């Protein structure tokens, strides 16, 4: 039965007086009784038209979510300070909503559909408006040479995937297949990267708890291709991640306390999720 | 026959209990060996079978009025346990399902309940508001002794000699998820009136078909008192809890020199 098929209809049930007890159970078994309301209440026969289509896993992650806000500028020609190109280590861990949605489950595969929305604004009293700017985006996979200056050889994009966006155009989109080295992503990693041996020194053997990989998805880089305009134009790029063809493999309870860092630590003081209400008061 | 009486036997060991609930197979898949369509490494796997698959017994634990709950990490708890521990420390890659069996017998006059939860990827929080993810391997792998939950959070104030320990709060399940939703995981509840034992058969769940056991813990077992122990005598009642584990369908692929981690 596909997800848009209807739920099972409730059969009519009359009054009953017999040893066939469905209402009693044992939670200690770890099961829960698969009751239907007809089996412990007197019920009418009704055809049920509702469907669980909109509770599909593919539908749950359709709403794409923001993951970063990278800041870029093209400074005035007379200034001595360098042009700010931005570099972002790709990760979902820094925005709480998508993190909570993904951390409902332990392991998952999904193709990532990235969409970039760009905005720009001036920063000084002058009105010497700059022409329509063009922005380069670059996928820098792990171990590739990250750029140092805005006009380095690294921006020649000989092998790196890259996208050029002209301002005022519709937002740029690109689809990324499942790029994880494992058979599925691991949102939690209950282990270490290196284990300290007795032969090793104290400094050599240490590693972070939960750091499955220090560069997992790769690195994203952005610059303004245009030369120094006489007036300072600054810009911000918003990246939106939209999972596609997603599968998940182990549920977990969602988090209550307010998140702190990449790991699963919690900050002092803020360990109070619930609030008061008297037991006797409706 | 009756559902209340159960017998398990793996290898040269056997457990028999007369007050058992029906056993739970976590996520409805029994443990099984690697299928040829899913095996990544090419070297011949070792299959110890009877040589490793028997019920070992971890340390005994005392449950009291003031106690707080306890936790263990697998296969790390079995590192000292015989030939399974030696095979784990000698090889690089390995995998294994487990049958966890918890025994806590008490008379009809006692009351209380334990929640036996099996948590995949059971991460836990650190003992510092600063220095996230800084917990060391020595503290992060207690071995057979296990570790204790705490009723409150108290970060380490002295950065000149940091402890790098865990500090898992009990009602947050040590990771920031409210305890009432812990039942999403596979579970069985001890009620001292109902059943004196509970058992979970846990398959090998991991993103990789086979994984480094020394680096990575697949499952973690949490024993939390959902209702406190109580007895007629006011003079601090205490009863023991015992956790026993049997690896099932274990495999170890790649052989290397002995690992000697700096636990000392």
């Amino acid at each position, epitope marked *: 039965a596909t997800s848009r098929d209807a739920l099972p209809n409730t059969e009519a049930s009359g009054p009953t007086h017999s040893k066939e007890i469905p209402a009693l159970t044992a939670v200690e078994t770890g099961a829960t009784n698969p009751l239907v309301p007809s089996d412990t209440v007197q019920t009418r026969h009704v055809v049920q038209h509702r469907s669980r289509s909109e509770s599909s896993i593919e539908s749950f992650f359709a709403r794409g979510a923001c993951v970063t806000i*990278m800041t870029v500028d093209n400074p005035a020609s007379t200034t001595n*300070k360098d042009k700010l190109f931005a570099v972002w280590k790709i990760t979902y861990k820094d925005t709480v909503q998508l993190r909570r949605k993904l951390e409902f489950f332990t392991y998952s595969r999904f193709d990532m559909e990235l969409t970039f929305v760009v905005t720009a604004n001036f920063t000084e009293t002058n009105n010497g408006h700059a022409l329509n700017q063009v922005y380069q985006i670059m996928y820098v996979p792990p171990g590739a040479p990250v750029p140092e200056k805005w006009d380095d050889y690294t921006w020649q994009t000989s092998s790196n995937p890259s996208i050029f966006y002209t301002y005022g155009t519709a937002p740029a989109r690109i689809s990324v297949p499942y790029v994880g080295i494992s058979n599925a992503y691991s949102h939690f990693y209950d282990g270490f990267s290196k284990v300290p041996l007795k032969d090793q020194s104290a400094a050599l053997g240490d590693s*972070l708890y939960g750091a499955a990989s220090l560069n997992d998805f790769g690195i994203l880089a952005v610059r303004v291709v245009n030369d120094h305009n006489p007036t300072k134009v600054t810009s911000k790029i918003r990246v939106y991640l939209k999972p596609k063809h997603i599968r998940v493999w182990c549920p977990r309870p969602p988090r209550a306390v307010a998140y702190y860092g990449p790991g699963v630590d919690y900050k002092d003081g803020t360990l109070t999720p619930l609030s008061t209400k008297d037991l006797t008061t409706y | 026959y009756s559902d209340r009486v159960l017998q398990l036997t793996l290898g040269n060991s056997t457990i028999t209990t007369q007050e058992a609930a029906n056993s739970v197979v976590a996520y409805g898949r029994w443990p099984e060996y690697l299928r040829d369509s899913e095996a990544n490494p090419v070297d011949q796997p070792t299959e110890p079978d009877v040589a490793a698959c028997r019920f070992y017994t971890l340390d005994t634990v005392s449950w009291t009025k003031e106690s707080r709950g306890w936790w263990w990490k697998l296969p790390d708890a079995l590192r000292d346990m015989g030939l399974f521990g030696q095979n784990m420390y000698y090889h690089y890659l390995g995998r294994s399902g487990y049958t966890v069996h918890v025994q806590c017998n008490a008379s009809k006059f006692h009351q209380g309940a334990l929640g036996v939860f099996a948590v995949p990827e059971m991460c836990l929080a650190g003992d510092s508001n600063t220095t996230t993810m800084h917990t060391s391997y020595q503290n992060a792998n207690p071995g057979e002794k296990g570790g204790t939950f705490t009723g409150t959070f108290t970060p380490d104030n002295n950065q000149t000699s940091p402890a790098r320990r865990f500090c898992p709060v009990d009602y947050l399940l040590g990771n920031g998820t409210l305890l009432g939703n812990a039942f999403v995981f596979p579970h069985q509840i001890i009620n001292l009136r109902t059943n004196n034992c509970a058992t979970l058969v846990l398959p090998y769940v991991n993103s990789l078909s086979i994984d480094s056991m020394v680096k990575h813990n697949n499952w973690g077992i949490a024993i939390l008192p959902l209702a406190p122990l109580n007895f007629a005598s006011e003079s601090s009642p205490e009863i023991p809890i015992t956790l026993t584990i049997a690896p099932m369908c274990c495999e170890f692929n790649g052989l290397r020199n002995i690992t000697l981690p700096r636990l000392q």
Partner: antibody
Amino acid sequence: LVQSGAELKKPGASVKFSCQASGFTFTTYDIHWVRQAPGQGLEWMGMISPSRDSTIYAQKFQGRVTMTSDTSTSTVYMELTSLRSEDTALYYCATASRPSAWVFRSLYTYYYMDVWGTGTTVTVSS
Amino acid sequence: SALTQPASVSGSPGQSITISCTGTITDIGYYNYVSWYQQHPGKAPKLIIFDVTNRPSGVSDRFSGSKSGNTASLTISGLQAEDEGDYYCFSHRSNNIRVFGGGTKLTVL
């Protein structure tokens, strides 16, 4: 350009440090304090963000050091509420305004210290 | 606490030398906000390398650096007599605290 106040010498009692900067850098960028004991090397003290008044202190001096700001004159004040013989050092006010290329926590831009004040010596002894 | 550095390093003019700054886990390892500063006697510090291998304007190209593991090093190729002075390591230490190194006195022989 950044300006700083005088040098003090009294033992035990509290001492107030003063640092003044241009309005744009004051309002836009954070201000950092660093001490330089004789020949011992630099040591971070804290961070002031006058744009939002969020303040973070080094854990070594978490109690004694206190900081506050003033928008009218584009001036920040640091006060060491109590002093010891170890505090006999040269102190530097500094502004962080050269951005890093790496995006910090996916939402903010890191800034390294790039403009340093002249600094002020302080002595703690009879 | 502070980042480790050698106490002093020396070499004749024209030589190529390396100053090593080894931090703990987190620190130079996890983050890339590692920078180097220079300070002559009687002067305030001056930035010489701000990202891992990136150089600010007005600093000569003979300064260079790189990262590996929990260690990052400053390499001065073609040492000149004017480079004599103190050199300090600096990095970001986990959640919202900052740390300097012990410093190194570089003297030209």
